[PDB]
Amino acid sequence: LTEIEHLVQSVCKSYRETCQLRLEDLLRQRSNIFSREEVTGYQRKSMWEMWERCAHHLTEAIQYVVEFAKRLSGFMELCQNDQIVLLKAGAMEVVLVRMCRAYNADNRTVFFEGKYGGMELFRALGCSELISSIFDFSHSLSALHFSEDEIALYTALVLINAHRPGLQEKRKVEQLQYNLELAFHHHLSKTHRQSILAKLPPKGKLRSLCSQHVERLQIFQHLHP
Numbered sequence: 425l426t427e428i429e430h431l432v433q434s435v436c437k438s439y440r441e442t443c444q445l446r447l448e449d450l451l452r453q454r455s456n457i458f459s460r461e462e463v464t465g466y467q468r469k470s471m472w473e474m475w476e477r478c479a480h481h482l483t484e485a486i487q488y489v490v491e492f493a494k495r496l497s498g499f500m501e502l503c504q505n506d507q508i509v510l511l512k513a514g515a516m517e518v519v520l521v522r523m524c525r526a527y528n529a530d531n532r533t534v535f536f537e538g539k540y541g542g543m544e545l546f547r548a549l550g551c552s553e554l555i556s557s558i559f560d561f562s563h564s565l566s567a568l569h570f571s572e573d574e575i576a577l578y579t580a581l582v583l584i585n586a587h588r589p590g591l592q593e594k595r596k597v598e599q600l601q602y603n604l605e606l607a608f609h610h611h612l613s614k615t616h617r618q619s620i621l622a623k624l625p626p627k628g629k630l631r632s633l634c635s636q637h638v639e640r641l642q643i644f645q646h647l648h649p
């Protein structure tokens with residue numbers, strides 16, 4: 425009951441130490457929305473510049489996930505090859521999940537470069553379908569009203585996934601996965617939140633979305649290296 429409770433707190437500590445922005449701030453900033461003139465300003469940027477901006481922000485967000493993983497008890501006990509495979513396959517998925525905190529379902533806006541703005545902010549990039557999908561995903565995750573501890577445990581499980589192709593110690597990643605699943609379950613029971621298990625996105629949906637994402641990202645990169 426303490427080995428589990430300590431694991432839960434280890435994941436929560438690691439998450440807290442590695443998220444960029446406080447939930448309190450993001451909710452506070454909800455009134456601070458981009459003006460029409462400011463939105464137009466973003467829409468008038470070249471695709472090259474918007475891509476440079478976004479790629480930079482995503483590189484940063486991914487770096488925090490690497491840090492999150494380094495502080496996850498058990499992650500660093502895996503062999504380096506497996507660490508890398510998990511990070512390569514899961515970090516962007518974690519970033520996508522983390523972002524639901526910065527998404528406002530009331531007006532379908534996201535916190536971006538200091539203010540809240542809608543889908544249309546990213547028009548210069550010319551991939552409305554992908555962006556719209558990212559917004560839809562965020563919207564449905566935001567309906568769950570994830571707690572900070574729930575985000576920590578859920579994103580830990582996004583990352584520690586034994587089904588990633590390329591693992592050399594699959595059984596050891598399984599052990600960490602199952603311990604985290606039990607920790608998640610234990611924690612939801614104590615908070616009377618077991619209902620959210622019935623409400624989580626189908627695991628493939630997150631893979632699917634981030635595959636579409638990486639597909640477009642590889643197009644961006646071979647356009648502007």
Ligand SMILES: Cc1c(C(F)(F)F)nc(-c2ccc(Cl)o2)n1-c1c(Cl)ccc(N2CC(C(=O)O)C2)c1Cl
Nearest residue numbers: 482483484486487489490507508511512513515516
């Ligand atoms: C693995 C890794 C490491 C670490 F910890 F291992 F040094 N640091 C980063 C990192 C920091 C900032 C960014 Cl951006 O990435 N990554 C990392 C990650 Cl988390 C995700 C994807 C990729 N990609 C997609 C490409 C591929 O699929 O080959 C390479 C990489 Cl390199």
Ligand SMILES: Cc1c(C(F)(F)F)nc(-c2ccc(Cl)o2)n1-c1c(Cl)ccc(N2CC(C(=O)O)C2)c1Cl
Nearest residue numbers: 478481485516519520523526534535536546555558
């Ligand atoms: C514009 C874009 C692209 C694309 F299509 F250009 F690749 N991908 C994403 C993305 C989000 C999560 C993942 Cl995973 O990918 N965005 C995007 C979106 Cl839709 C919304 C907000 C933000 N940001 C950076 C800030 C933050 O770090 O919270 C707010 C970004 Cl970068």
